[PDB]
Structure formats: C-alpha cells, structure tokens
Structure 1
Amino acid sequence: LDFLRDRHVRFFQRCLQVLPERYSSLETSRLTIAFFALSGLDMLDSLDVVNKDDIIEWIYSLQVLPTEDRSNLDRCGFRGSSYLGIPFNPSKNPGTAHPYDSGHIAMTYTGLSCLIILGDDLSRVDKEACLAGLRALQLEDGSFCAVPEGSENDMRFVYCASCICYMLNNWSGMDMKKAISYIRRSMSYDNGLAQGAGLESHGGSTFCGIASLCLMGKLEEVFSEKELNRIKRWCIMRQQNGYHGRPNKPVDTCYSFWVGATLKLLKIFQYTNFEKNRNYILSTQDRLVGGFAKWPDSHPDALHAYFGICGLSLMEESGICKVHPALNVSTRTSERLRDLHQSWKT
C-alpha cells in the first residue's frame, strides 16, 4: 500500500533501546544492530531523534586499542559489544590487556560506518591499529576471517575489509591483488559470484564481490565486458517480483538491496521492473510495529527493515534518502565522508 515512515522511525528507535532476553543471541553483534537502526534513521532523515553524543561514546568504548607495549596490534578493531567484561572506556586511556579481547571485522566495519553516520570525525580511531588488525585477518587465498583467533572465511568479510580500507581511505589494510584474485575465483559456471570458489553463486556474495571491486575502483579492470554482461544477466534474473538470493529459492525483501544494489553498480537497475519490486517490499511491511520482514505476514527485524528501506531508496521512494549502493550508507553520509577525507589530506 503506502510507506509508513513514522512507524519505521519508531521501530528503529526501539532497536536502539532495550530488547527482551529472547534476543540474547545478538549480544556479540549489537553494534551491527545499532548500524541497521542508525543508518536506517539516517536513510529516513531522522537522526535527530537520538543522542548522537551518547552513542558515539558507546561505540568508542567498543574499540580494541593497542596496549602500552603495542603487542596486540594484530587484534585491534572493534568489538560487537561489551560481553567480555572489560571496564567501560570510550577510547580514552590506552588498551587494557586481555587474553581473548580482539576486534571482529564486521564490527570494525559497522563501527566506523556508525561513527561517520553520527557525525564523528574518526580522530579517536587508531587508524594504523585497525589496518594492522585488518591485514592480520587476510588469508593466503586472499579472503578474510572475522577474528584473529580464527573463524570461517568468505566473500562477506572481503566486503568488510574493502569498506574499512575505503572509509579509512587507506588500502594498506589488505593485499588488493590477492583479494581481487579471490573475487575472480568465486565466479560460478552460471556467472554469479559465490561465497568462495566452487560454491553456489548467491545474491549476497555477488553484491559483496561487485561492491568490493567498485570500492577499489577496479570493476572494469577485473572483469571483461563479456564477463560483466554475464554477471548482469545472472543478477537481473533474480527478480521474480521482489528478488531471491539464488535460482529456485523464494524471494526475500533484503535482496531488493543486495541484488538491486549490484544491478545499480552495473548500471542496469534502471531496466528492472520497479512496481513489482516496490509492491513486494511493501507487502512485507509490518503496519502495526513498523519495520519490514523477509516475507509478508512474517515478523520484522532490524536487518530486513533497513534493507527494505534501502531497496525502496534504489527507486527513490518519496521520503527516503538515496543510498550509496557500494558503501551501504546514505549518499549524504558518503558525501560527508568525502569531505572528511579531504580535510585529512592537509
């Protein structure tokens, strides 16, 4: 039907507040929940309803700073929350050694991203430490892990690494040649991009791969015109009404961004069917509590609410800022980041 803007603003506000114990499994990734809500409000031009200063301090308390002896550089970045019990410290004093405290690539990414959205200038971010931590996460094949202690490695983290290097405007955080190699090797026989070589191509990983290359400014250089045409074909075939993540799977609101944004980066989103996409997204809108769900008559969540909104933004929904398809922030925020980068260059 119509877009319930105010309802979604309240939904995101609640996300930043207090959650029932049934959400305990989100503890270690509260920072990305914050990202969804903050970036979501930003996308709806409502950041005024939150105390940017309080949140900025909270975010900074999540930064893993190097210790006096700087012997933990390979573990710096941001935590998803304070579940380790380390005393509150908004990046003031130096790092307090802890056997198992380290950053998480997806948190370092959403953390920096949140700081920029809130207006912070990143002066309190130990840029060199984060980049040091980032490098430590890259594997031989070019992909990345989430934490230095070891974890699964795939395209998702390659995108995270790319976003971090882009925001800190310094690519010393990764071996770009090896990352690009990983992205190329993930292209499937059906022409989409998978989580890794040999795996089933997926809308999510295709976005991560393509967006990473755009952030590096090497899309054209890495894939031939013939190749890009094959990828475009794979991506545009994902639309049924809304978009699904892979052939023969049901559509899900979030793909309106994952795949839609990829199409935007490949400059052919304009050739998709807008009405059917918009209608599907809106059908997953929760008119009572706000936010969006993956499917209609399904429970809403911060992730699908954010991506449903970014999906709508791709088609310029009345009342929603234009999203920067590769950086996953509002163009406004991407512009502010450009200014920020300039000021540093002095």
Structure 2
Amino acid sequence: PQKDVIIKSDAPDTLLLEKHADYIASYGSKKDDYEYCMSEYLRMSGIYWGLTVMDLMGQLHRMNREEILAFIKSCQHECGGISASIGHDPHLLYTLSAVQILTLYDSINVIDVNKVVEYVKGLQKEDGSFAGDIWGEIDTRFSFCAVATLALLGKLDAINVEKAIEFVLSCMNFDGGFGCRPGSESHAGQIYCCTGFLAITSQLHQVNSDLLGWWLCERQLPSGGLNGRPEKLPDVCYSWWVLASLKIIGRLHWIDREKLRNFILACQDEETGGFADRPGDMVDPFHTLFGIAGLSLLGEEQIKPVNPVFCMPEEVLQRVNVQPELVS
C-alpha cells in the first residue's frame, strides 16, 4: 500500500462559503488564555491568515479594522522590525505578515515605512542571503519575506537584488527543487518561497519549468491531494504551496485539478466550518486560508482570484501596482 488518505463517500463535496466566514469571525472569541499564549508567537501571521481568507470571500468588513491596525502599530519596535505580538522580538516573518495586513486595509502609513525597509537591509549578508532576525538565521524563506515586503512598499531595489538572486539560485538541487540552505533537502514550502522570490525579482527564465514542475507534480497522490515531500501524507497547506508554485512556473495544467478540488473540499467541516489538513482532523484558521486559496486557483467563482506569490486577493495587489510576470 502507498501512503495516502481515503476520501469517504459522505465527505463534503460542495463549497461551504458561509460556514467558513462564520468560523473565522467566531475564532478567537473564546476566552482561552492557553491557546492564546501558545500561539501568540505567530499572532501577526495568525491575523494575516484570518483577514486574507475573509477578503477572498468578500467578508473582510466583518473583522475589527481599527483594533488590528492599532495592534500592528504597537508591534513595531525601535529597530524598525515588526514582532508577532506585543512584547515579542521583531522578525521578517511577522514584518511581512504586518505589511500584508496593512496592504489589505490600504493603511500602510500606520507604521513608519522607512524604518521597515532599513530593517530588511541590515539582514542581508555579503553573499546575498537574508536572516530572520538580528541573530542571523539563514533560510530561503527570509529571502522571500525580504523581497515580498519591499515589493509591497515599492522599494525592492533598496537591497542588493543582484546578490539576493545569486544566493537563491545556489539553493537549487538536482531535482530542481529548493531547500533552506545550499545543500538542504528539497521542500515544497521552500520552493514556494524561491519561485515566489524569482518571480518578484523577475528571474523565472533561469528556472527549469519542466524539471521543477515534474518534481511538484510527483507530489500528487491517488486521493488527489498534494504533499510537501516524497512518502508524505497529502496536506492542504502543502496543496497550496505546490499548486501556487506550478502557477508561477507556468505548469498548473499538468496536475488533476478536479481530483485536487475534491480533496480540499473533503477537508471541510460541515458542522463548524474552516479547513483542516486532512479529512477528519481539527480545523484551524491556518489551513482555512490555504483551502480557500487553493480552490481559488482552480477557478472557484465564489472566491476572488488569488495571487500565487503573495497569497493575497488580486484586486488588492492591482491597487498597489505589484503583479510579477508569470511563466506563460
């Protein structure tokens, strides 16, 4: 037997858009101090998942706008970077999550734009790599988070773009995939970052769309779902990262869209709402975004067109004039 999930006959096969909006709106309402403290280290991203999935369904107005904007403002530190929450240390992951939220509400000037760019600059090394924070953790995610943030600020050339691309291309392995560091194992998540990186910096021509697309397509299991790496169970989050990468490299038509669609829909919850990783498990705002964004790429008309690089509504990125060219 091969490692894969089995979609049941009574599994959800229709989009429950209403019960998804009600789930996100009711999430966080429960005064659970434990779950809050346990996930406060990524709250800035937690709101990003929550808001983006609501704006895709055209229900962004149901969220408290002012409270979030006041939260982000008090999250920016003296060094420019934005932490995950109040009291935490600044990081690229939450700096990007902050900007993405401020872009949805078109309130980018709540936070000093200049000091943010200056924070991203100081994280770039001599080779072209980027660190997560001032402690110097090297990863290709941070290379993506860097150029993604600066692209939403209109100041991409602020960093050494020439060397930044030089580092990412050095992380490419034999199978065409990318990893954390030069020599690391290929991972669908890191590919999503590197393909998104080379899209913003306009270097998709130096990517083997056939070989890399081949690696991504081999991640599709008989259930229709996608996984991050060989011999891994299918996951909705992985289903988005692999799908979005294909759309970037221009090889989206290779995978079975109908089977993957039925996989994502099967991960729904007919009682509570939201998306889980696999049919049967507990749902969360994290997978709820990638479940909705996944169906949007497959052409779900009830969901706004989503950008494969920034994971944001296309109408939002059309406003700020940032839409990187994708492979035809």
Q: Same fold (TM over 0.5)?
A: yes
Q: How does 1:124-273 map to 2 (within 5 A)?
A: 124-148=110-134, 150-220=135-205, 222-223=206-207, 227-240=208-221, 241-273=224-256
For the residues of structure 1 that align with 2:251 and 2:209, how far apart are their CA atoms?
Answer: 11
Q: 1:49 to 1:245 in 2, by over 3 A?
A: same
CA drift at 1:267:
1.5
Match for 1:80 among 60, 77, 84?
A: 84
Q: 1:27 maps to which residue?
A: 40
The one-letter code matched in structure 1 to 2:212 is I
Once the two structures are overlaid, the 10-residue window that deviates more, 18-27 or 194-203, is 18-27
Contact 1:284 1:297 in 2 (8 A): yes
Match of 1:89 in 2: none
Whole-Å Cα distance in 2 between the matches of residues 244 and 129 of structure 1? 38
Q: Distance in 2 between matches of 1:52 and 1:195?
A: 35
| 8 A contact 2:246–2:252 mirrored in 1 | yes
The 8 Å contact of residues 91 and 132 in structure 2, kept in 1 or not, is answered as: yes
Structure 1 residue 16: deviation in Å? 5.1
Aligned: 1:332 with 2:319: no
Which residue of structure 1 lines up, in the alignment, with residue 262 of structure 2?
A: 279
Q: CA deviation at 1:142?
A: 2.4
Deviation at 1:173, TM superposition (A): 4.2
Shift of 1:19: 5.3
The residue matched to 2:283 in structure 1 has which SS? coil
What's the TM-score, normalizing by structure 2? 0.88
Q: Give the alignment partner of residue 315 of structure 1, picking from 298, 302, 320.
A: 298
**1:130-181 Cα shifts (integer Å, max 9, x gaps):** 1111111123442222221x15321111111011110011124432222212
Secondary structure, aligned partner of 2:27 = helix
Counterpart of 2:116, as a letter, is C
* CA drift at 1:57: 2.0
Q: Tell me, which stretches of 5 or more residues in structure 2 are unaligned?
A: 1-12, 323-328
**1:131 and 1:172 in contact (8 A); partners too:** no
Instruction: Note the C-alpha offset of 1:205.
Output: 0.5
- C-alpha separation in 1, matches of 2:167 and 2:26: 39
Q: 8 Å contact 2:117–2:150 — kept in the other structure? A: yes
Conservation of the 8 A alpha-carbon contact between 2:204 and 2:249: no
Query: Which residue in 2 is equivalent to 1:342?
Result: none
1:228 Cα shift? Answer: 2.7
Partner of 2:9: none
* Equivalent position amino acid for 2:160 in 1: D
| 2:57 corresponding residue in structure 1 | 44
Which residue does 2:97 correspond to in 1?
Answer: 110
d(CA) in 2 for partners of 1:178 and 1:172? 12
Q: Please give the root-mean-square deviation of Cα atoms over the aligned residues, in Å.
A: 1.7
For residue 338 of structure 1, give the secondary structure of its aligned residue in structure 2: coil
Distance in 2 (CA, whole Å) between partners of 1:55 and 1:318 is 29
Identity within the alignment, % = 29
* Counterpart code for 1:113: Q
Q: Is the 8 A contact 2:171 2:178 kept in 1?
A: yes
The answer to whether the 8 Å contact 2:264/2:291 transfers is yes
Aligned 8 A contact 2:82 2:94 in 1: yes
CA contact 1:134–1:173 (8 Å) conserved in 2: no
Per the TM alignment, residue 63 of structure 1 is displaced from its structure 2 partner at its CA by: 1.8
Q: 2:285 and 2:129 mapped to 1: Cα distance?
A: 27
Equivalent residue number for residue 2 of structure 1 = 14
The one-character-per-residue Cα deviations of 1:64-115 (angstroms, maximum 9, x if unpaired) are 2x4xxxxxxxx3121111135xxxxxxxxxxxxxxxxx52111110101101
Moved over 6 A (4+): none
Partner of 1:90: none
Give me the TM-score of the superposition, normalised by structure 1. Answer: 0.84
Q: State the aligned residue count.
A: 307
* Amino acid in structure 1 at the alignment position of 2:253: Q
Q: Read off the aligned partner of 1:15 and give its amino acid letter.
A: Y
Please report how far the alpha carbon of residue 282 of structure 1 lies from its aligned counterpart in structure 2 after TM superposition.
Answer: 1.2
Alignment partner, residue 326 of structure 2: none
